[PDB]
Design a protein around this ligand. Structure first.
Ligand SMILES: N[C@@H](Cc1cc(I)c(Oc2ccc(O)c(I)c2)c(I)c1)C(=O)O
Ligand SMILES: C[C@]12CCC(=O)C[C@@H]1CC[C@@H]1[C@@H]2CC[C@]2(C)[C@@H](O)CC[C@@H]12
Length: 249
């Protein structure tokens, strides 16, 4: 495989447990608290993963933290969808080996509709027969799919880096598409899939935001990093100061 592909497959984070006590009844407080703890843990891996991405360190240090704090949601949801597809054939949401959501939990989580959309996204991997290489390249591009309206500290470098990752995706598609009427069609399908992630991410952004505000009333715990990011970064997205980068209108 090319060097780019070797790197993506090599830095891909391993299994991460949520530390949820399945010995406890499925309550809203317990379920969401574990989801937050999982988010905190995953965030650590995302940071290491990102800094290990080709050219990422070329971005200004401040922009490195910015893009991560804005796209972590989309990145995790996309990865979760892939796990769910690969582990339980998208039958359930495989957040973590110790935190698998079934119908009952989807309802109990008080975000059934959102879970439904994530399951659909999960199924898309199967319907479109997404390859492991395509998944990796798409997930990397998600790290560069949401920035502030006023641009980053160094938009030049970000725009160049994003472009290079979009090109890498093309090669992965053109490195097997022997059919002349499937190559271009494939890029269309993948870009559409990538876009369908943002709408889902925004719904979770609004949901987690509201949950944090009334977290003390519903007995839901938010880790240090999660609480800080959801109250400082997320609001910028919900207020329209930070918007996702769509391929299609
Ligand atoms: N295509 C290559 C890997 C390859 C991947 C990427 I993302 C590239 O983007 C940049 C641009 C400016 C930089 O400072 C850095 I660091 C990286 C380049 I240049 C090459 C391979 O497969 O070996
Ligand atoms: C990103 C996580 C945790 C990591 C993952 O696999 C995807 C999943 C999507 C729902 C998120 C959850 C983290 C905690 C959140 C943000 C809850 O507060 C509400 C929505 C939850």
């Amino acid at each position: 495989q090319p060097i780019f592909l070797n790197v993506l497959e090599a830095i891909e984070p391993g299994v991460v447990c949520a530390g949820h006590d399945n010995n406890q009844p499925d309550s809203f407080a317990a379920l969401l608290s574990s989801l937050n703890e999982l988010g905190e843990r995953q965030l650590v891996h995302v940071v290491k993963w990102a800094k290990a991405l080709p050219g990422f360190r070329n971005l200004h240090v401040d922009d490195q933290m910015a893009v991560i704090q804005y796209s972590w949601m989309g990145l995790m949801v996309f990865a979760m969808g892939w796990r769910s597809f690969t582990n339980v054939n998208s039958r359930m949401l495989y957040f973590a080996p110790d935190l698998v959501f079934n119908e009952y939990r989807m309802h109990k989580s008080r975000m059934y509709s959102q879970c439904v959309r994530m399951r659909h996204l999960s199924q898309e991997f199967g319907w479109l027969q997404i390859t492991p290489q395509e998944f990796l390249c798409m997930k990397a591009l998600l790290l560069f799919s949401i920035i502030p309206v006023d641009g980053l500290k160094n938009q030049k470098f970000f725009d160049e880096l994003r472009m290079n990752y979009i090109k890498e995706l093309d090669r992965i598609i053109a490195c097997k598409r022997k059919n002349p009427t499937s190559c271009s069609r494939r890029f269309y399908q993948l870009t559409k899939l990538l876009d369908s992630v943002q709408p889902i991410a925004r719904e979770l952004h609004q949901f987690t935001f509201d949950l944090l505000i009334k977290s003390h009333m519903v007995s839901v715990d938010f880790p240090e990093m999660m609480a800080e990011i959801i109250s400082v970064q997320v609001p910028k997205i919900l207020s329209g100061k930070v918007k996702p980068i769509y391929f299609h209108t």
